[PDB]
Design a protein around this nucleic acid. Sequence first.
RNA 1: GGUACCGCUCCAGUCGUUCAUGGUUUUAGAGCUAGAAAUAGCAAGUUAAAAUAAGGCUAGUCCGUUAUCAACUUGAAAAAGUGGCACCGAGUCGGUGCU
DNA 2: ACATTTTCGGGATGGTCCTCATGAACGACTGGAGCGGTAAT
DNA 3: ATTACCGCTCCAGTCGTTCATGAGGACCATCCCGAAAATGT
Length: 1368
Amino acid sequence: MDKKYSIGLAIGTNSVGWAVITDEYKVPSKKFKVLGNTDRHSIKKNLIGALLFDSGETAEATRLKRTARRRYTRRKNRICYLQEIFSNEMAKVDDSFFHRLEESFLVEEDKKHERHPIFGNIVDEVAYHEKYPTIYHLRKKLVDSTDKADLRLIYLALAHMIKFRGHFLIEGDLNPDNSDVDKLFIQLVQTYNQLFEENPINASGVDAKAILSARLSKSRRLENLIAQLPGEKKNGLFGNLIALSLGLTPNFKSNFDLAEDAKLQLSKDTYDDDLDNLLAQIGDQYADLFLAAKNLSDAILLSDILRVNTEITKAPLSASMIKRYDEHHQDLTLLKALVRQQLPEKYKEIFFDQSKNGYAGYIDGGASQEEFYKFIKPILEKMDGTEELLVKLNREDLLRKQRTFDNGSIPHQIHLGELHAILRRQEDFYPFLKDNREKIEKILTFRIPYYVGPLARGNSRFAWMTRKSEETITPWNFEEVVDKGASAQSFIERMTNFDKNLPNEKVLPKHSLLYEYFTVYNELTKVKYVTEGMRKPAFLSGEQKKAIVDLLFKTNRKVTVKQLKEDYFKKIECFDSVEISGVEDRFNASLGTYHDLLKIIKDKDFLDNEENEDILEDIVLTLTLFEDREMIEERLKTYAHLFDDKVMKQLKRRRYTGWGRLSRKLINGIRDKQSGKTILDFLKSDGFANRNFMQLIHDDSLTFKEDIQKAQVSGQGDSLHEHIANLAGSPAIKKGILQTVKVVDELVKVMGRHKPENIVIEMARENQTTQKGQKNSRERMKRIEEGIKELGSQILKEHPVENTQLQNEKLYLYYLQNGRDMYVDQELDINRLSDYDVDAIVPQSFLKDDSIDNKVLTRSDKNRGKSDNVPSEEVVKKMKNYWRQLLNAKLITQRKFDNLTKAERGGLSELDKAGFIKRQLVETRQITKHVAQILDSRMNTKYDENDKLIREVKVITLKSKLVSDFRKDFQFYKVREINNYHHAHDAYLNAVVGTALIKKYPKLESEFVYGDYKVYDVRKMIAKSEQEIGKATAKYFFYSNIMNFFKTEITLANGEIRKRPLIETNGETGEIVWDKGRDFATVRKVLSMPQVNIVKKTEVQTGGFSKESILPKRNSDKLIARKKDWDPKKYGGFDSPTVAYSVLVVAKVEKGKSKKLKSVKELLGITIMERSSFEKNPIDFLEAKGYKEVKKDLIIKLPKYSLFELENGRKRMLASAGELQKGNELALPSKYVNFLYLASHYEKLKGSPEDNEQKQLFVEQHKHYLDEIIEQISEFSKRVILADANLDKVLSAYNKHRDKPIREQAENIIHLFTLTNLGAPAAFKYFDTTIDRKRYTSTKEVLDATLIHQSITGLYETRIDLSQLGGD
RNA sequence: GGUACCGCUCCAGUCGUUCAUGGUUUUAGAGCUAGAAAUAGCAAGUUAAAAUAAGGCUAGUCCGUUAUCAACUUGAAAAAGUGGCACCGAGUCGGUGCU
DNA sequence: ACATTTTCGGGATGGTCCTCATGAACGACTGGAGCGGTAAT
DNA sequence: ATTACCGCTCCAGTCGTTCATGAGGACCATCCCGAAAATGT
Ligand SMILES: [Mg+2]
Ligand SMILES: [Mg+2]
Ligand SMILES: [Mg+2]
């Protein structure tokens, strides 16, 4: 039947709630038949409920997981690449090479050959370190070599240089020399002075290198050079030439008075090509400055990162490492002698003992630099003869470990320098190197471009390449085995802007000539004209529109009325007296691409010919899509009759970026099957007036409605996956939608297959801020301003600040944190906010908060060092109280603060701390825009109507901004921190409001999403806003819109509270929709109503199998070895083995001295690994695990979050492999929840209206609730742990801390509401007492536990029999 | 009562392609004196190489950090489908009656 | 030949330690706010 | 041929209303209970 009920849902990050409301009854109570045992007659449940689920790894964590797979694969392949080059050659000349490489692993008993790494004999193996203290000395030896080295030490050096290959970040050949840098600074100044004799720049003996070497910002380095070298300004020619060498992108358009942009950069191979175009126009005499600037940048890079001069060695990189390496042993020997003489007593302790981060732990362990320096620093300060040792601490030159990240970030080019020498020196000793050098230099330089990508032998979705035959895919003989044109085309067809009306096609480039013609013809259509014979204004015809485009738009970019009157009408149409109307003095439309083409080609033969426009569109499409300049050449070859050799060489520079929103097919590729005309044909000439482009597509007058029916009306298939394959990358939103559509689909089916009137859905994010804009940013300012006014200042009253200044995050971070960082407490300033770096609190991590409160403005992040130990402990000690002052002024959040105290308490959500100090944040919830569309797509899959457009199922998305007044009316305090049954009541209220809104049409409407400010009437009494505080509208007064439409209460009066009468008309037919004598009482009755239908989702664990590390520290049976036959005691197994689910089977395992069979059912964990054969054949699996004698009907599978109910009155849940989870819902009176929230609230706040007056008096008169709460808790311990254990400590603490602040105790009490959750046995700090951490191994009372299998939808429940359990 | 398609700009989030290092595991790594011996002290310390998700298609110079995955019936199998209401009440969800 | 004392072994339990992440060159999307376009009956 | 049925304002710019909402497992130290053997009667 048509309409009987409505449903509502509330979608969170890791939970979905729902509720069903029906006109015929007020009690959401319904029965189901018990499956299996039938322990209860017919179990009833509440229709209001919620589903809990695990959210998984979000955005940047998913990013890191795919990156991590490709990450080591690259390093592994590079090691394998050079191995394939030399291994076979070494095996051919040395028979003993092969066996040593193969027998390098495993125990003696399985080993067939001795290791002998370098020489081939134990006697000679330990002769190496006598001349070579490190790999870097062998590198110097081979680079400066005059003699022959063994192929094992040659491969040893070459293998180091491909494992330690270095980064190919910047394109082009950089100068590997540091011989005479000083000269380059003098020659640039003198060359400028010779070319510009009007105002010479004076060097004045200034050392420019000293300014650049110092750790200053790029802006400050430029400024200091301009201040010390007089003759030119920071924004002048010389300043922009310095900026280029600083690695910036200057634009010399304003410098050479150019009509077009002239940006230069040193990061691209085409820079030399751009200089050829530039010098062709400004002349040869300016070449020296740009070539010297390029070479100086190369010289400065090596000077800064190596700090070693050339010619004393041809290996300055290896030499740079050696100097410090030797100094480490000399400084350590010195300090060791000083400690022996001054501190005999602590001599063993200082060097041997890991616990304080000493020398032994530092060398053999992973001890932090800052902790190591911290320990030895006051020791060196107290000791005599340590002056030089104290300097090395500040320089960071004291005992730095050779292998560390800071010594790893080396570029590919300086590595090629030394490698070219390693190969060249040995060419007259090994002739094989002369032939292999070509292949070696290529793989050392090699990098995969976008248009080639994956070179996979097999067939798969992401295999873009077409392979010719079974040979190779290596760059060697590349064109003979694969075609980069085929991979470039398949790459572009998959990755580019796509047409949203054509699923398999793509849009035109933004430089399309057709795209530009479309806008010009629209403006020409608006034009009316008057002539010498024509009496009244008439519109332009198609031939006249074409004539104006052919004449005026092809001779000047923009057209004006004078041009039409003096040129077009007098020349083409031959009228002296004419007039143009419909437009002003000029048009908005213009041709941009057309005149750009004339300037580059400089001809007219490619213009007016009918076929040439299609030729130019194909060429611009190619120029936008492909950087590959040989692909551009091949496009130009088919049209070579229009393009000579010079223009084709000039075009080889760069891409025409950006696309339009329409493809060509729609515009002039689809013809009307009755008139024969395209949309472009109708645009040029048709009937009176026009409509919007999408309106003309939908228009019933054209035959394009058929194309809509064949494409759009068809829709997606039966499978849900196909409908949720769009919207959101978040696994939290994805799973929320996945379960939401399933719940809605099932609710409509089980409700007698009747259709709901409304489906009301909410979906939100962890919004930490408003977005950029004066409708958003302007309010973010208030969060800063309150902190400023709390601290105190006269600045805000003395001088007003314009609202357009503070619009972005970087300007907000400065005033939120003040002029100081949050890690080392060093100075920040306004002029340095775009010059200093910004960090994330938890980058590339499991969960990420929505925007500005997840980030922090810092000075340098090098202190992070991939560790969880803040090196600025002493800073945290004073800043912790400062950070609490910031939370009190609401400048930083509770989660932001707690991430800096993690070591003391771990995790556990405290997110809505704002609730007692200020909650002000109106959320947009942009995700909700397409949620209804995905559901609507499945729900209204029916076409039994003659284009009636009548929907049967209406899905409505709701904003939570309307719920606030309903929380007040029904006295709801719903912070999830004190209630994990949160979504159940939200979804109910959502169904109430969304249904309420449609029963009588709204009195005050607003525009789509944006709404309020867009359309409103001018009122002077809201104009005082902008002048005083800034723009404001109904977004602030949204509560008054609710009062206008419903008239529920009067908010203009304090004291006695009176509201709208109990029995009032609410429907469009004059009927009563909601009744306060029945409905209102029922809503508040549901709040405390027993047995709400809430469950943790049933599944089994898939994905995330293990972490890429080995833990030989573990040795239990659950450890999965890295290789099957390798001993876990030596070579270990993989970090964190993942169990998909468990199976309950009677054991065949023998116990004790008599070897008795365990004839009782036991838990066997099924791993994601072993599952792969278990599901296919469980018999062989069970026999291998010790469960040999078993029958099919005796095997019971236990999925993830399986439930148990004990006959002794307890409820429990299964984790994964057999571990015990808490379970059991919380039955507790509502009088405790309201008290604790309000008790903290009314600490420093006083009441006034009737309700607030009684709430304050309630907390003040009734302080006995804390004593009743510990009494209720002592009765829940008995249902979980049995013994009270630590509640004697908690009761003692509750009697002890009665003289402590009400708020500060209520701030952490939220951790005791874990009783509502089915897991989370949390440990936390209360006030001065920190509670013990416990976990549940298993249930002793096995035979009393009944196995429960429930549906994910929360409907039917299966109870499994106890007669099969056994026991002997 | 009674609108549709968007231009220009700035900022943010979602992210993708590409490349490198280190943490860490493992093997080779020639010592002296006292004491039955456990055990202790001193001489003495300078390095290199290999490797890092089970498992497997298309059996790889390749892919893999995932969802439905409970009872029940039909289907070789892939795959698909069914889940009662009137009527009263609410401290660990019960009852009258029909189906 | 049987019961008690005796030592060694297993399970339930809690305390402490363990954890593969960094980012710029090059390049694109949705999406919102403020400056706006164009109007009929 | 028209633009809120309702938001009609204060000796002054004020803080505040609601929400997305919680790391556990392995190894080692330890106490209590149970089985087979040696000894006494
Ligand atoms: Mg919500
Ligand atoms: Mg950072
Ligand atoms: Mg909610």
